[PDB]
Structure formats: structure tokens, C-alpha cells
Amino acid sequence: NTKYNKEFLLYLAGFVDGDGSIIAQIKPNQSYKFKHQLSLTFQVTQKTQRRWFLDKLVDEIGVGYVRDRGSVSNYILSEIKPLHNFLTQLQPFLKLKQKQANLVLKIIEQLPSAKESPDKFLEVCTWVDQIAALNDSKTRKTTSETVRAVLD
Template sequence: MKNNNMQNKGMKIIDKDELIYLAGFIDGDGSLIAQMVRRHDYKFKYQIRCTVQITQLKKRRHFLEKIQESIGYGIIRDRGTVSDYVLVEPKCVYWLLKQLSPFLRLKKKQADLIIRIIEQLTSSKNSAVLFVQLCRLTDQVALLNDSKSRTITAEVVETTLRELGLI
């Protein structure tokens, strides 16, 4: 996943000062999320979704619009009194986190785990064992985020795959 490939698809070169600013924004008001999502149409019945999200009050939506413009990808959605900038395309999340990781402080571990997950996603498409290993890394991200509401864990995925005779 090289930067020049991403630039061809809309991702922009982000200078160091902007990366430092973005890293601070994400450390403060952002979330780096890895989660397992039930997908009945997928071979292993689950998808690992990695997300970069920044939340602001709606009155500060313009900050999110500037971030979206800087990155060149992602969407902004409004919910209630807040707006979220959301980036979920794995190649884009990877590209951004590879650049941001050196500047992150609070969320560096999450970023590095998500980078590892995305690097191995393609290989896991044909290996239930590797997919479960990536689900365990996903659990580690959730633990670092103090996630309280998640119900799908690596253990749940592994049990499902055993019941299906895939491992």
C-alpha cells in the first residue's frame, strides 16, 4: 500500500505540520476503531471493519470539513447535536494511520494494531485461523478503547467458525 497509489485515488499528500495537527485532533477528539461486524454473506460470517472517526459539535462541523478536504477521503455525517468525520475504506485508513502513527501519543497503540490488521486482511480471506488471529488483534484495539457495548469478540467468531466446520 504505497502513498502514490492512494494519491491516484483521491488521497492527498499531507505535510508534516498538518499530520501533527491531525494526530493531536485524533488523540483528543477522535476514535481509532477495529470491530467485527456480522455479515451473513461473507465466507467467515464476519467482517473486520477499521475506522478513523472524529466527532465535533455540529457548530464546529467546519473543522471536520477541513480535515476531510486535507485527507481527500471519508464522509461527514450529522447525528443529533454532533457531526462525525468517518473514514472506513481499509486502504485509506491504512494510508492515513501509517502517516499519523509517529505523531500519535494516546492512540498510537490502536493505530499500530489497526495497521497490522489491515496489512493481513487480504491474507485472511482464505484462512479461518488467520482471520481469528486478526479478530484477537481487533479485541486488543477494543480493550485499549475501553469499549463497553461490543458483543462480538474473537471468541464469538471462533465459536461460529467451529460450528460451521471452518476450523
């Protein structure tokens, strides 16, 4: 469990508050028991000419990777353990995306028990709704209600 230098945390907090993205999804996927996968992502974008900055982030944070998608590249961090350890340390300093961060931590700690009872699973999908409503959701398609159906 890498503990981050506090100075680096303050900087990163500011950076995450400005151009950070905290994403929670419910993904339709027939291979899962409840027919969807709970997915969490932290993400930052940078024009591809400046992806050298994302690559140094991979080093600094020590986890995640870099996606190129044409004109822009993404730093991506999905791994739930590293992500939990990351947001745990960053959360206290966040001013704008602290709510999303809290919801993600809460969702992560409840993953074990969510995968046992369809009730706990659904309460967890409503936490995903709150994250989506705190962001600027434009194209969201699958919701807790999508899962409330289906589970019937």
C-alpha cells in the same frame, strides 16, 4: 498516495490524540464466508453547529466524509487504502492512540491472507480485541470467541 505536509501531521496527531477514535469491529454478517466482516473506522465528533470544521477536514485530509446524527456530526474514514495511508503517516507522531494505530495497520496488511484461512482470520479477530481493550469499550458484543464458536 498523498503525502501530508509534516506540520499538518503534527497538528492532526495532537488532535487525534485528544479527540480521535480508532475503531475495529467484527460485524455479524451472513453474506461473508466466515459470517462476519472485519471493519475499521477512524472517527472524530464535533457538535453539529461546528461541523464546518469536519467539512474542512474532509478537504485537508482529502478523503472520508461527514455524518450528521442529530446534536453531533462525525468525520468518518473507512476506506481501507486511504485509511492505511493515513495512519501510516500519522502513527509516528501519536502519543496516546499509537497502539490502536499499530494494530489497525497490522490488521490491514493481513486482510488478504485472513480471508483464506479460518486460523489466520481468528488471529486477526484477537487483534481486534486488543484495539477494543485499549479503547473504553462499553457495549462490545462480538468477539474473537464469538468467531471461535460459529467457525465450529
